[PDB]
Structure 1
Amino acid sequence: GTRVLIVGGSLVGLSTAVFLAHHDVPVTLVERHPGTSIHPRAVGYYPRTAELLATVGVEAPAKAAASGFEKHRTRAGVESLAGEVLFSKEELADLTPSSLLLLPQDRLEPILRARAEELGAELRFGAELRSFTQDADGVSAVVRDADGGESVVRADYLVAADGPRSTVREALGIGREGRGVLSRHVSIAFGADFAAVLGERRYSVVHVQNDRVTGILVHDDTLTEGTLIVGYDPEKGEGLDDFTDARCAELVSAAIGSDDVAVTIRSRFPWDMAELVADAFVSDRVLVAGDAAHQIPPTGGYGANTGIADAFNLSWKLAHVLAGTAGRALLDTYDEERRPVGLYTARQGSLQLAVRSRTATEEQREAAHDAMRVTMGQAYPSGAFVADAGADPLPLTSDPRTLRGEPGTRAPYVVLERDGAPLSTLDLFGDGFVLLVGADGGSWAEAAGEAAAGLGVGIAFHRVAPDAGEGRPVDVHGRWAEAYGVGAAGAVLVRPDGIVAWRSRDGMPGGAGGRALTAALRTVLAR
């Protein structure tokens, strides 16, 4: 019944459910909590993340939800929201059609949950993974339901999206490396009448510091929901268990500073600022994604972005393995591609925290990359792609504006029109393998047909030409070939995650094209 089991119904588990169900993989997700967290948690989704979400129709509703928060421009430090304001303060179009999406996680997760359900994912909230075993043929997961009933779920694979203290990662005996836990926090979600203390003021984030509380205060778009994130110090013997119902009510009222405002405490969750990355992201039939694979310091919000990109990398790979169109070795490329990105991103998170806290060395400032380089400029060191002979390999990340279709990088964004309606290369990706060819590459259609039939895998062919007739994509400024680093007779094979798999810079005469594409796609698919 269930081919992939997902543990965790937070951002990465739900992203995995959407991407898997998009690729028509039967999915069961278990989440111990009775629904999605109301905590805002990570709030910034970079353009690359938005492009990923675009492929499953989540970017549009997420942008709609984000416009509600767009007036929240002011960052402030205050004694309390009602009291003294200490301080306050407030072009990618050639690279990406997406902008930074400023939407709290508690608003993105319902959109993902809704889309996974639409696509036919089975989501079980109030369901706890107790333990699992795996064998040559599959995974057997003990799940305890909301009624305390147990049952054993049999899946082909298990994706562990079960967060930083992942009992799955620990049960596999996967260790982690990195600088470790930097500070311990509690996120306190509450309802309150914010409008009565804000008046016309709208904040992105408020730093609260008075004698009774220090922490970070946020209010939602409706002005009815907030979150106070406070530190505790274990070397004073303080712990999560000190954050009682009464203690949470005291901290929030101290942060608001009014007492006429009625506060309803919803829930408290622990959260650590940490730099910890799993030594391996794949163990036989278990894949580890998101916070379970990498705890990333929050400065820059790279963690949430990195986890959605993990879900996107692994989901089509499971689909092809489960379809028998790929060898099981294709799953190991999830580890190959994503672990180095995870470890690099965790270190970039640590640099950003150092720079932000004004404790960075000049070397740390020199090492710190733009968020666009960190999230859109990746070149995987190796994995499910064929590198260009002779080509100087790329470093793990570059200025994404400098990328020109190198295998292991994001297939570049080129603006197209189809029947006068705007399109881009990115719209062609996300469903299946795609072969793009230049104006002089009409013969690559037959090569795509030959490769597709040989390997029993779909290949969508699009010649990209600056005239193109009815129903075909027009390259309206003739930039496709230069952007994809090929000649007008060349072709580029793009994976279902929009990463370049292979290219031919030049034409290939007769059946040579078909033979070369079949060989390349056979390597990519571990066959």
Structure 2
Amino acid sequence: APDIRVPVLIVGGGPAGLTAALALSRYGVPHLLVNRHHGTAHTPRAHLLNQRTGEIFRDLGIADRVEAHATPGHLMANHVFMSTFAGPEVARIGAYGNGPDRIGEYRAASPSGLCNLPQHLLEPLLVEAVQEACVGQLRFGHEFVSLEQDEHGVTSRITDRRTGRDYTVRSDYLIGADGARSRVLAQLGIALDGATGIARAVTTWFEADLSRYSAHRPALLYMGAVPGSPPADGRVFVSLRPWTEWLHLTFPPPTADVDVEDHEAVRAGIRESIGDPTVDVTIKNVSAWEVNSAVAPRYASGRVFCVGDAVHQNPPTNGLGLNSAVADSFNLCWKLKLALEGLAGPGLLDTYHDERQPVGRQIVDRAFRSMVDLIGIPQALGFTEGQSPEEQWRLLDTLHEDTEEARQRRAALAAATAAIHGQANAHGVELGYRYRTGALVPDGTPEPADERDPELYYRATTWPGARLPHAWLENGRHRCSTLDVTGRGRFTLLTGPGGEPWRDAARDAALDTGVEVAVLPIGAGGGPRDPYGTWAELREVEESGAVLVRPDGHVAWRARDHGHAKELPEVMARVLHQPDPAARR
């Protein structure tokens, strides 16, 4: 006899969990979320919000609230390598699409920019949105202990940490959003692939007016090396509030004792990284963080689905962790809604693993290689163990000399610096991932490809599994994206001139499946216009064709022309995995 019955139990109220609660809130699905801690994040942790996250927050209706508090992209314009903050600079690249060679592609790719908003500010914004909708319930100070699942539901044991009293929750489904060392994932018998404690990071949150060393070269990341240090002893400054509020990251050797409470010693390390004793440093927090590089081989078992840091862990390079957490929960929730309605079978819920687990592998691999690229810069300079400050100042000074030695060091520094685009301008990784199996019906066309590095370069496509291309439309006098007039908990069929047969096809699809397909003509039927012609360029179907958009803004299917309209009802049945045991496997 269970204490609570609810359609969905969310375990964990970090970004992944709160994203799932907000999505289910927007879709009208009652849920309970339990979070072990009494409050939201009390330190910055992850901060970089990429364009995909920006699009998901527009769909969930919180983008304006996030933007009001976040650092804007133009104050993240560079990625800097330096000696001390007050000393000579080593190298610099354009970051986050601000450089003239990337800014066009970044603007064409999304209605959203990149911005910077740390977790102690983001999480309260998600909490407020969830409380305002009043569809599900948040319980902070409540700890998940264990689960059993069966054919029909999931029975979970929960502890109220204040009262010490246990209770049980019976749910149709459970979301594991409980972060690294997930108890939910463990209870499923799923063990991550990869290494644990591959490094420690010591992250210090502090206040210091460093505007004299930063404002002329605005950046999110200033990566420093104090002359007389081995190459591994890099000092990473992260701008949180230009140019007064900061993180400082060090990577202590495996055999160093870190006293997180020793503010005195941490303050002296930061003053050494700055190299200007007149800058007053106030410590706000110091945290030691075990860095892993690991990914779950399976994301789900039965009626339990794990998201975010429960199924992927990586170094902070690329800032992919937070963005991938948001996109995991946004992939899953519209699928749980249709299953709970009886409009989709367990076959649709299986596509969560099929679509998201390969992205988990991709981001863990990319973040690892970007962490290893960092040491290339001080190596190119000729920095090693056992060098005096004076020897390293001389290597920096002799860098610009008219010798064979200096020419080769300048070449090695340019090559080491070029590789940092893999973390500063990784547009293909951020926006260009495509689901190749899952809640989609291939059209028989080959995947578009070119000679450009697919990690660095995004290429807009309606190929099924791809995120729908962004184009500026106009609805009367209202400027709106292709991504703004799709999603929001429904399927949308984008059509054009000569697309009338799509209306009866969509009508038949909804009758056969009980799922509505909204028909939206662009540049026809009095619908939104394509003022620049950009949508006609990107849609890759003819005027009479169609692009079928899922509730998460990925393309489920496309059709060159209205010759394919009669396929739509069967396409929708296959996307929804509607349990037809005669249906064709």
Give the TM-score band, short-chain normalised: 0.7 to 0.9
- Aligned match of 1:456: 514
**Deviations for 1:83-115, whole angstroms, at most 9, x for unmatched residues?**
x54548682232222111222232222222222
CA contact under 8 A between 2:42 and 2:120: conserved in structure 1? yes
1:72/1:379 CA distance change after superposition, 3 Å:
closer
Query: 1:406 offset after TM fit, Å?
Result: 0.8
Match in the other structure for 1:33:
37
Which of 99, 119, 122 is matched with 1:105 structurally? 119
Q: Residue 143 and residue 354 in structure 1: after superposition, are their counterparts in 2 closer, same or farther (change >3 A)?
A: same
Change (3 A) 1:140 1:99: same
Decide whether aligned partners of structure 1 residues 144 and 357 sit closer, same or farther in structure 2, where only a CA change above 3 A counts.
Answer: same
Deviations 1:397-423 (A, max 9, x none): 687753431111111112211112212
Summarize the alignment of residues 405-416 of structure 1 with structure 2, pairs less than 5 Å apart.
405-416=462-473
Take 1:263 and 1:291, find their aligned partners in 2: how far apart are those partners? 31
Matched, 1:376 2:431: yes
Q: Which residue is equivalent to 1:124?
A: 139
Q: Distance in 2 between matches of 1:491 and 1:65?
A: 39
2:22–2:126 Cα contact (<8 Å) kept: yes
453-462 or 492-501: bigger deviation: 453-462
Once the two structures are TM-superposed, the CA of residue 48 in structure 1 deviates from its matched residue by 1.6
Counterpart CA distance in 2 for 1:116 and 1:130 is 24
SS in 2 for 1:330: helix
Structure with the greater alpha carbon radius of gyration: 2
Q: How many residues get paired?
A: 507
Contact 1:44 1:103 in 2 (8 A): yes
Q: Using a 3 Å threshold, how does the CA distance of structure 1 residues 450 and 12 change in structure 2: closer, same or farther?
A: same
**Aligned partner letter, 2:121:** R
Residue in structure 2 matched with residue 172 of structure 1 by the alignment: 188
Counterpart for residue 142 of structure 1: 157
Deviations 1:378-410, CA, capped at 9 Å, x for gaps: 221210100013x22468968775343111111
Please say if residues 181 and 272 of structure 1, whose CA atoms lie closer than 8 Å, have aligned partners that are also in contact: yes
Paired amino acid for 2:152: D
Deviation at 1:164, TM superposition (A): 1.9
1:381 maps to a residue whose letter is: R
Which of 236, 241, 251 aligns to 1:231? It is: 251
Q: Deviations over 1:133-179 (max 9, x none)?
A: 22222222222224133222222211111112112212212122235
The CA distance in 2 between the partners of 1:322 and 1:137, in whole Å, is 12
Aligned with 2:155: secondary structure? strand
Q: SS at the partner of 2:557?
A: strand
Q: Say whether 1:327 aligns with 2:327.
A: no
The answer as to 2:198 corresponding to 1:182 is: yes
2:475 and 2:456 map into 1 onto residues whose CA distance is 30
Contact kept, 8 Å, 1:351 with 1:367, in 2: the verdict is no
- Give the distance between the partners of 1:206 and 1:34, measured in 2 at CA: 34
Task: Return the offset for 1:230.
Answer: 3.7
How far off its partner does 1:341 sit? 1.3
**Structure 2 match to 1:392:** 446
Cα distance change on mapping 1:188 and 1:133 into 2, 3 Å: farther
**Does 2:423 correspond to 1:423?**
no
CA distance 1:172–1:269, shift in 2 (3 Å):
farther
8 Å CA contact 2:431, 2:458 repeated in 1: no
- Does 1:57 pair with 2:61? yes
Q: Could you state the TM-score of these two structures normalised by the residue count of structure 2?
A: 0.77
Please give the root-mean-square deviation of Cα atoms over the aligned residues, in Å.
3.4
Query: Which one-letter code corresponds to 1:114 in the other structure?
Result: E
- Distance (Å, rounded) in 1 between the aligned partners of 2:234 and 2:419: 28
Instruction: After TM superposition, list the pairs within 5 Å mapping 1:50-89 onto structure 2.
Output: 50-67=54-71, 71=75, 75=80, 84-85=86-87, 87=89
- Among candidates 490, 500, 504, match of residue 545 of structure 2: 490
**Partner residue of 2:290 out of 264, 269, 272:** 272
**Cα deviation code 1:255-274 (max 9, x no counterpart):** 257799684655x5442333
> 1:489: Cα distance to partner?
1.1
Shift of 1:320: 1.0
Does 2:365 correspond to 1:347? yes
Among 174, 182, 187, the alignment partner of 1:158 is 174
How many angstroms does 1:313 deviate by? 0.6
Deviation at 1:250, TM superposition (A): 3.5
| Runs of at least 5 residues in structure 1 that lack an aligned partner in the other structure | none
Does 2:151 correspond to 1:96? no
The answer as to whether partners of 2:179 and 2:309 remain within 8 angstroms in 1 is yes
- Give unpaired runs (5+ residues) of structure 2: 95-103, 381-411, 579-585
Larger displacement relative to structure 2 (281-290 or 154-163): 154-163
User: Structure 2 CA distance, aligned partners of 1:230 and 1:33?
Assistant: 27
The correspondence for 1:504, drawn from 559, 562, 580, is 559
8 Å CA contact 2:370, 2:420 repeated in 1: no
Larger CA deviation: 58-67 vs 409-418: 58-67
